[PDB]
Design a protein around this ligand. Structure first.
Ligand SMILES: CC(C)NC(=O)c1cc[nH]n1
Ligand SMILES: CC(C)NC(=O)c1cc[nH]n1
Lengths: 411, 411
């Protein structure tokens, strides 16, 4: 089985329009959460979220091309273009069949759907945009990236709710490991802040309603948590076979050593109280990496700020790591970014890789009063410089679909 | 030890095809910035700039000669011919060895290089013009001017990015001071508005992207500034030893009393936040002039409309001038002209000399909301008649290369 390394990273998040600006916010404990400006939400129970501020699509695409694409596609292409530039890779006739794309989304083009739905109900079907389908379907980040850069390798898209970015990266790594590609651009994107998004998650009572203090709403493992915060953006990584990277003198950030999956097979939105599914998934990833639990230094948690979810993840980490659960550091960067849904696993993979580069555990902000049994090192309030050789990233999605990635300092 | 005065000036700018037309625009607060007409930029993130409008090279050169020369050389020769005519100097066998030229450029013949590169890639090397080298190299403004007018004195060219025009004038003044010339034609020219120029500065994210309001894009010290505006043109001055000027009854505009240089030694494109390099450079120029900071009445700023640059220049002016920083007037004429790069220091030297002639500080247009700490007299919006005995002109360039000129009312 071939080794897979990370040679390029790209991002849009509520904290920044690139990786270095986002990471500066993470290490400073900055919130990207604010009242939403782009629609009137006076009728909604949640009126805040994590928006991308000041995005200029014309840095990436012509105004002509951009007009045809939903925001989630613009965001996915921005992160992908950043990652490919960051990698330094040159695409040629000799390698274009060996370079593929796996960029996913949880909910896809809900804004475009809403806008075309308005035209349809008011004025009938002949008002629908000709670009409605190709500019809204989830696989068009992978499609449009492949067309723009001439990538002819495996071309697909995952949609697994909060697990999307984690599955996208893990399965792209499998393509490289088993020899069906040498390079993959993998990750996810999301822009679900429309009436149907805030209204839909609101109707399921999944969202924090702390409208008076939006920056305090996302509070993983805190006793006063009341649901997740909806956020927008994108993450992309260039995954590359090790000898391919070495041959061209690529800068290597870290090694992707492990990928695990499981299903809870329990409930449509609630985890089992002991997080048994999450425990199996983390053990599967560590076994894939050939690592003992005692070798893990940092966990980037799922940690969405939900009553049932946050405590199930603690139970799963205690089950897998035993006494070592009190030696590792675990934090939820969703305390600062909110929940990017299909992009969460992509941006959190990048944060896990930068924790390895910079030897620092990002904080869990807003952890004022840890709940019953939440007695691990959850890196409350402030970043913690420490030794990190192995970093684990968890994603648990609606339906009980679980994914874990394991990254290692490269040697 | 000899005194140096200005006896002739010439210009092409986005505001006019000569000095008086350009200065009328400056004092009226007119913008020279517009959507670019000479190429299709529909695919670029910046689609506007400061173009020279209605330039006729046949006013200066035969069609034969002009066809051999890049636009930046045509522009440099136009300004130089204007300055020499303006000075009234007669070139003879008795003085031609005592008259030299120092005309520079930041980027030089990028248009010609791009056009010859197209021929080379499509049709191979025998399609390259025989005039490609002598018609594109930066020293051919000095070369062609010397041949056309029979000037046999010191003959050279500076290339120091945004500092080019300032270094060119200061070093020409040193030649006269030290006795190696009695007259120098000095300044700079630029025409970087080709695909490689807009594309190159765009790729570095150095340019404003305010395509919806081009005349509002250049907004030095304004909280909503987002990078510089690329502009084209040329400036030339006839510098002359004082007794030489007096003897022939020359009209004297002003005295060039000081020239200072420094390097930031900090970063390739960013200044130090406190502008320590700019402060050393201004002090060096004042020490050269034998002036105290309290004697400065007007500063023509570098003021390019960049986030880091504009606030560094304020810090440097506060450091050098102390309480007097609130008594002098400082403005950026790039608010109107945009950034002429290698020509910026030449056209801004001319504006500093005319501020002395006319006793008026040109405005900083578009200064709607001055940023934190930008609380000096920045001559917002409208020209300000006032007493000006001493005017300073600043230029700070890529690489941290700094130059300052000091001009005085002549007595
Ligand atoms: C999103 C739901 C189904 N899952 C969890 O919150 C969770 C926590 C631990 N294992 N699973
Ligand atoms: C062009 C860059 C390198 N320099 C400045 O903008 C600047 C401002 C004050 N000192 N330096």
């Amino acid at each position: 089985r071939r080794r897979v390394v990370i040679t390029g990273m790209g991002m849009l998040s509520p904290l920044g329009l690139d990786v270095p600006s986002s990471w500066e916010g993470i290490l400073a404990g900055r919130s990207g959460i604010a009242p939403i400006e782009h629609m009137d939400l006076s009728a909604y129970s949640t009126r805040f979220g994590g928006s991308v501020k000041g995005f200029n699509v014309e840095e990436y695409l012509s105004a002509k091309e951009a007009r045809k694409l939903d925001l989630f596609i613009q965001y996915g292409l921005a992160a992908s273009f950043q990652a490919v530039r960051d990698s330094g890779l040159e695409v040629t006739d000799a390698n274009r069949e060996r370079i593929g794309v796996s960029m996913g989304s949880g909910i896809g083009g809900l804004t475009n759907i809403e806008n075309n739905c308005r035209s349809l109900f008011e004025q009938g079907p002949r008002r629908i945009s000709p670009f409605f389908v190709p500019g809204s379907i989830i696989n068009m980040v992978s499609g449009f990236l492949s067309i723009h850069l001439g990538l002819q390798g495996p071309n697909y898209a995952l949609t697994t709710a909060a697990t999307t970015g984690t599955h996208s990266i893990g399965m792209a790594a499998r393509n490289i490991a088993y020899g069906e590609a040498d390079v993959m651009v993998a990750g996810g994107s999301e822009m679900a802040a429309c009436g149907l998004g805030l209204g839909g998650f609101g109707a399921a009572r999944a969202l924090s309603t702390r409208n008076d203090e939006p920056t305090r709403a996302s509070r993983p493992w805190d006793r006063d948590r009341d649901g997740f915060v909806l956020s927008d953006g994108s993450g992309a990584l260039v995954l590359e076979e090790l000898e391919h990277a070495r041959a061209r003198g690529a800068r290597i950030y870290a090694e992707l050593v492990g990928f695990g999956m499981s299903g809870d097979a329990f409930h449509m939105t609630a985890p089992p109280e002991d997080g048994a599914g999450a425990a199996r998934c983390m053990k599967n990833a560590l076994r894939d990496a050939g690592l003992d639990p005692r070798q893990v230094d940092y966990i980037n948690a799922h940690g969405t700020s939900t009553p049932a979810g946050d405590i199930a993840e603690i139970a799963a980490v205690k089950s897998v790591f035993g006494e070592h659960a009190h030696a590792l550091s675990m934090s939820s960067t969703k305390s600062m970014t909110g929940h990017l849904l299909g992009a969460a696993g992509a941006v959190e993979a990048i944060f896990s890789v930068l924790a390895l580069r910079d030897q620092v555990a990002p904080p869990t902000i807003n952890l004022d009063n840890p709940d019953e049994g939440c007695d691990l090192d959850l890196v409350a309030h402030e970043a913690k410089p420490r030794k990190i050789d192995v970093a684990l990233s968890n994603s648990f999605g609606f339906g009980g679909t679980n994914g874990t990635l394991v990254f290692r300092r490269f040697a």
